Amino acid sequence: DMYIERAGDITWEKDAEVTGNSPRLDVALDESGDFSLVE
C-alpha cells in the first residue's frame, strides 16, 4: 500500500539556484498521456 509523508511548505525561495534552458518543441500527446516529439 502507498503512503504519504510531509516534505515541506510550498513557498517561493528568494535567491534560489537559477538553472535550465527554455526550449520550444513541437509535441504530440497520445490517448495514454504520453508526449512525443514531432519532427
Partner: protein, 156 residues
C-alpha cells in the same frame, strides 16, 4: 492523518525497503499528484485512508478526498520555481524560465530540468507561491535529458 497544506512524498513498501514513487500537493484537504505515480490506487496517511476522487490518464493527473483545487496558470513570461522533492533528498527550490510545448490543441509551458524517477508530482510555483502545475510528464530530447510539461488540472 496529516492534512496540513504542503508538498508530500508518495512512498511504497512493496519493493526493496521504502521506495519513493512520486510527490504530491495537499491543498484545501485534497491531495493532488500525477496519475502515473499511484495508477489511481488508494493512499495511506498515518492511520487515515485517502480515496481517489477524480483522475484522467490523458492529462496524467489524479486528486484524492475531493475535486482538483489547483487553478493558477503560468503567465507565459516570468521565471518559475520547481519545488523538487527527490528520493532520499531534501525539498529544494530551482528557478528556471520555461520553454514551450507547441501542440495541435495549443501551447503549454515546459521546464527543462532533470530529476530521478520518484520526483514526478513535484509542484511548479509562481512568484506568489501558487501552484501553476506539476512536474513529471514530458519528453526525452537528443542528449537524453528530460523536458517536462507544466501540467495543470481544471478547478470545476
Amino acid at each position: 492523518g496529516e492534512t496540513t497544506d504542503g508538498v508530500y512524498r508518495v512512498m511504497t513498501r512493496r519493493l526493496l525497503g521504502s521506495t519513493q514513487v512520486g510527490v504530491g500537493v495537499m491543498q484545501e484537504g485534497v491531495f493532488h499528484t500525477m496519475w502515473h505515480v499511484t495508477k489511481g490506487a488508494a493512499l495511506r496517511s498515518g492511520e487515515g485512508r485517502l480515496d481517489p476522487y477524480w483522475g484522467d490518464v490523458k492529462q496524467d493527473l489524479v486528486s484524492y478526498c475531493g475535486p482538483w483545487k489547483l487553478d493558477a496558470a503560468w503567465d507565459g513570461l516570468s521565471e518559475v520555481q520547481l519545488l523538487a522533492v527527490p528520493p532520499g533528498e531534501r525539498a529544494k527550490n530551482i528557478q528556471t524560465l520555461p520553454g514551450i510545448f507547441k501542440t495541435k490543441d495549443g501551447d503549454i509551458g515546459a521546464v527543462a530540468l532533470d530529476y530521478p524517477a520518484g520526483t514526478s508530482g513535484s509542484p511548479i510555483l509562481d512568484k506568489c507561491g501558487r501552484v501553476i502545475g506539476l512536474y513529471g510528464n514530458g519528453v526525452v530530447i537528443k542528449n537524453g535529458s528530460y523536458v517536462s510539461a507544466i501540467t495543470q488540472g481544471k478547478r470545476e
